């Protein structure tokens, strides 16, 4: 239903500072808060957020509290200072998908119809993007209990804004791999993207570990996609795909040959522009 999301650095830091301001609890706390923003053109947007007062105990871990007085009053304030701004969903700090995050969404679904969640990271280390968002469905299959409230991950990305890029680029001042030439693609996706294939490669290997040892659900709805992958594995070197390849490339290196061929003539013309500069400078200057 909703295509993808847009997340700002303001909300991105604006969870982490709250994790600091409850960071004096020491023992254990998750950061849970209310996510605010709009969505237009079936593109989700996230602009602002805050956090709800919240506690939890491990013994009888089916008890949670969201102060709706704080919710109504503070969102009334945010509506008052910005009527354009509104509710969009929620977020929890999300290390590993806590258990109450199946009916928190049911607790606050009366506010937003597509009451969406956001899982973030407070210990940032990965080779990907540590921002996650699911969506609520209660989809029905064809075996066992039908209507099952399973969250489903819609794709996610960090959105920019012309206002906030001044502050972001100001707060970097650290490293910036611009001059995007023949190098920046090699590292933004050719070095790094293979490691992007490494983790998704290793993930199904980790799921695979139930061979006779792991959890109880065997396959049913996992192996049609895997069987579809191994059926969908590409063509081997026999056909014209080789000769179209060879044939293909062979066309591209022509254009490479022309471009490199003109570049040397350009630099040689600059050398003549240099000779004229130094010669008619030696006898004239002295």
């Amino acid at each position: 239903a909703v295509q993808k999301v847009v997340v700002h650095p303001l909300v991105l830091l604006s969870v982490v500072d709250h994790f600091n301001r409850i960071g004096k609890v020491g023992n254990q706390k998750r950061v849970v808060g209310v996510l605010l923003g709009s969505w237009q053109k079936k593109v989700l947007d996230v602009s602002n957020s805050f956090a709800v007062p919240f506690d939890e105990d491990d013994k009888d871990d089916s008890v949670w509290f969201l102060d709706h007085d704080y919710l109504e009053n503070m969102y009334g304030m945010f509506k008052k200072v910005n009527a354009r701004e509104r509710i969009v969903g929620w977020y929890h700090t999300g290390p590993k998908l806590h258990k109450n995050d199946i009916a928190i969404n049911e607790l606050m679904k009366r506010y937003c119809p597509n009451s969406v969640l956001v899982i973030i990271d407070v210990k940032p280390k990965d080779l990907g993007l540590p921002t996650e968002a699911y969506i609520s469905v209660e989809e029905v299959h064809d075996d066992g209990t039908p209507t099952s409230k399973t969250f489903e991950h819609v794709t996610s990305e960090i959105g920019a804004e012309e206002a906030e890029e001044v502050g972001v680029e100001h707060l970097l001042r650290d490293i910036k791999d611009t001059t995007v030439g023949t190098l920046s693609q090699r590292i933004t996706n050719q070095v790094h993207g293979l490691k992007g294939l490494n983790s998704k490669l290793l993930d199904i290997r980790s799921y695979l570990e139930k061979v006779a040892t792991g959890k109880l659900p065997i396959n049913h709805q996992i192996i049609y996609q895997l069987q579809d992958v191994f059926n969908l594995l590409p063509d081997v070197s026999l056909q014209e795909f080789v000769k179209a390849f060879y044939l293909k490339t062979n066309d591209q290196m022509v254009v490479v040959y022309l471009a490199s061929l003109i570049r040397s003539v350009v630099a040689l013309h600059n050398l003549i522009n240099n000779k004229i500069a130094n010669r008619d400078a030696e006898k004239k200057e002295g």
Partner: protein, 191 residues
């Protein structure tokens, strides 16, 4: 005035479903809640009163507020039907008591039982010594009908005012459908 925050736990379980008490059980304990929040409110303007239940779905129907009109509106057509779950009533009380406005306030809860309980006394003695280690003073007032003589309740309040607590109370239900105001005339006079 004196620092507390009154947290009432209402009983919307499925054994609250007759007119044995004269107007309505719901209206009777409802107006009891009204006059005890007049007592706590008019004895202390700082005290706020919100309501929780200990049924299957322990919902915060009203957020903890010094208002009473939302409390009245939710107690209108509250639909007291569902399976009681008392063992999570302790956690859904105390965790909100950690959610309260200030820990300078006295941890005081009133708890309403008008249904048969299926708890273990081991479970409420783990939660009871949990309330000992958390220093929590709850006076439980029984309503409606009950397993006679509060089975596990005397042991619970005993394991609540035990170890120099000795100030917590357990008002049992008299099994006669009378006007409950004189039934609760003792804790409102002296806790």
């Amino acid at each position: 005035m004196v620092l507390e925050s009154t947290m009432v736990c209402v009983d919307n379980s499925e054994y609250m479903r007759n007119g044995d008490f004269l107007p309505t059980r719901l209206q009777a304990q409802q107006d009891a809640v009204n006059i005890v929040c007049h007592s706590k409110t008019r004895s202390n303007p700082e005290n706020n009163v919100g309501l929780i239940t200990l049924a299957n779905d322990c919902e915060v129907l009203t957020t903890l507020t010094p208002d009473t009109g939302r409390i009245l509106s939710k107690l209108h057509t509250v639909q007291p039907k569902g399976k009681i779950t008392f063992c999570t009533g302790i956690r859904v009380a105390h965790l909100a008591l950690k959610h309260r406005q200030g820990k300078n306030h006295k941890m005081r809860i009133i708890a309403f039982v008008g249904s048969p309980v299926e708890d273990n006394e081991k479970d409420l003695v783990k939660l009871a010594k949990r309330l000992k280690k958390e220093k929590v003073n709850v006076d439980i007032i029984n309503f409606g009908e009950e397993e006679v003589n509060t089975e596990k309740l005397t042991a619970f309040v005993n394991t609540l005012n035990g170890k120099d607590g000795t100030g917590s109370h357990l008002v049992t239900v008299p099994p006669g459908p009378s006007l409950a105001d004189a039934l609760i005339s003792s804790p409102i006079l002296a806790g």
